[PDB]
């Protein structure tokens, strides 16, 4: 039989709306993002999807997207595992800054590189910064080397793909239907790996907020196909890159 | 050091409001119950409580109480384990019936016995009944003997206390701060065991919806003290037994 995996980026966050770099800052869903999360769950139900297990990050924009989806499915009882390994790419000293203001002060091309350059890291925090993850109780079990000062997509891959191979994929292989509710760069990391994409190809991909992305796997767990659920015109428009100045 | 445990009964459910026997029927919180759940979380924060791990049932009135509490604590990231072993006592063929109507048809004393008699079971379902737990996907892993047709408090103890001793108490002993969000009879089962109560004593106890109940344990994990958090006059009034005809 074919095995299905469902991926969903968190619904729009308040800092997505306000055009601020977020990273590990734990911002909530906007009002529109709550709407998006509920719509994704209703659509999954309509399309005949239910699950056996869910993975998400430790960031509330993703966790709350999952809770809203589970309620639409009448699966609030589902087992859930919440892991920092699925967190958004850390944005270093850019966390909290407005993207347009930052592009004006430092240059539009510099901001594009800090957003998207494959192995490029945003400017680093120091450990005394209020934003350093070591101060936060949900990272109490992490080492200095695990606690980021900044991350690139390359470094995001280096934590997401081991979690995939050690934990998520084996659960799928045991016959369980998995949903992953996560973030732009953690899901881009997984998609690059599953789709055999180059650095040039992954730089072009934007996964839109709140849109289910379904993968089919064959009996050897080689990906067979992937597709979005919902309104094609709306999704494709939403998957275009947005300027630093906003939409 | 003293170890703290926090217990909380689900916020008021829609069938609590409507005076219907619920059991394993998966009814949601009423509007007032959502208010109660959020208030419990805000109070726990104000009183200096945070957690390392949460247990709850597979029934949404309890799960949603926990989600609301965790959001007030800014601990949506907390590890959660959802177990049928913490479910409400199953109400057999009474599930969905109005308590007042049932007391009129069968007698007030008969209803009191079906509600509260220690080893008394409500009238049984048959396996073909739409309400039989075997039809529901979240009990797919249970055996016939685990799937109830009816339960008493005695039978509720027989599943809650092993879960306590095998799973919950060891986690506490490892130094983790636990919260349990559950149900009237599953929490009464645990309290009887922890408080060394007789059958006569436990029959008198009503744990009110949405009220934190804190236990202190000594170094040998013998209970030292237990107390409610919140407004004493309001809580004590709410802990009185309500007639079959309602309040
Ligand atoms: Cl959860």
Swiss-Prot record, chains A, B:
Pathway: Carbohydrate degradation; glycolysis; pyruvate from D-glyceraldehyde 3-phosphate: step 3/5. GO terms for molecular function: ATP binding; guanosine tetraphosphate binding; phosphoglycerate mutase activity; protein homodimerization activity. The record marks 183 as: Transition state stabilizer. Induction: Regulated by the Fur protein. Its EC number is 5.4.2.11. CDD domains: HP_PGM_like. InterPro entries: His_Pase_superF_clade-1, His_PPase_superfam, PG/BPGM_mutase_AS, Phosphogly_mut1. It holds the Pfam family His_Phos_1. The keyword Amino-acid biosynthesis does not apply. Signal peptide: none annotated. The active site is at residues 10, 88. The modification N6-acetyllysine is found at residues 17, 99, 105. Keywords: Acetylation, Gluconeogenesis, Glycolysis, Isomerase. Substrate binds at residues 9-16, 22-23, 61, 88-91, 99, 115-116, 184-185. The keyword Acetylation applies. One of its GO terms (biological process) is canonical glycolysis. It catalyses: (2R)-2-phosphoglycerate = (2R)-3-phosphoglycerate. PANTHER family: PHOSPHOGLYCERATE MUTASE. Has a 10-fold higher specific activity than BPG-independent phosphoglycerate mutase. Belongs to the phosphoglycerate mutase family. BPG-dependent PGAM subfamily. This is 2,3-bisphosphoglycerate-dependent phosphoglycerate mutase. The lineage of its organism: Bacteria, Pseudomonadati, Pseudomonadota, Gammaproteobacteria, Enterobacterales.
């Amino acid at each position: 039989a074919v095995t299905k995996l469902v991926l969903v980026r968190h619904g729009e966050s308040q800092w997505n709306k306000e055009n601020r770099f977020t990273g590990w800052y734990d911002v909530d869903l906007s009002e529109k993002g709550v709407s998006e999360a509920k719509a994704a769950g209703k659509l999954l139900k309509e399309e005949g999807y239910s699950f056996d297990f869910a993975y998400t990050s430790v960031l509330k924009r993703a966790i709350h997207t999952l809770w809203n989806v589970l309620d639409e499915l009448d699966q609030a009882w589902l087992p859930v595992e919440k892991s920092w390994k699925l967190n958004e790419r850390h944005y270093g000293a850019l966390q909290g800054l407005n993207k347009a203001e930052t592009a004006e002060k430092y240059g539009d091309e510099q901001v594009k590189q800090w957003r998207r350059g494959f192995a490029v890291t945003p400017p680093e925090l120091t450990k005394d910064d209020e934003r350093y993850p070591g101060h936060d109780p949900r990272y109490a079990k992490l080492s200095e080397k695990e606690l980021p000062l900044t991350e690139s997509l390359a470094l995001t891959i280096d934590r997401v793909i081991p979690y995939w191979n050690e934990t998520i994929l084996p659960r799928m292989k045991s016959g369980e239907r998995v949903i992953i509710a996560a973030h732009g760069n953690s899901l881009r990391a997984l998609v690059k790996y599953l789709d055999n994409m180059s650095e040039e190809e992954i730089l072009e991909l934007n996964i839109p907020t709140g849109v289910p992305l379904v993968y089919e796997f064959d009996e050897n767990f080689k990906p067979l196909k992937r597709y979005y659920l919902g309104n094609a015109d709306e999704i494709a428009a939403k998957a275009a890159a947005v300027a630093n100045q906003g939409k």
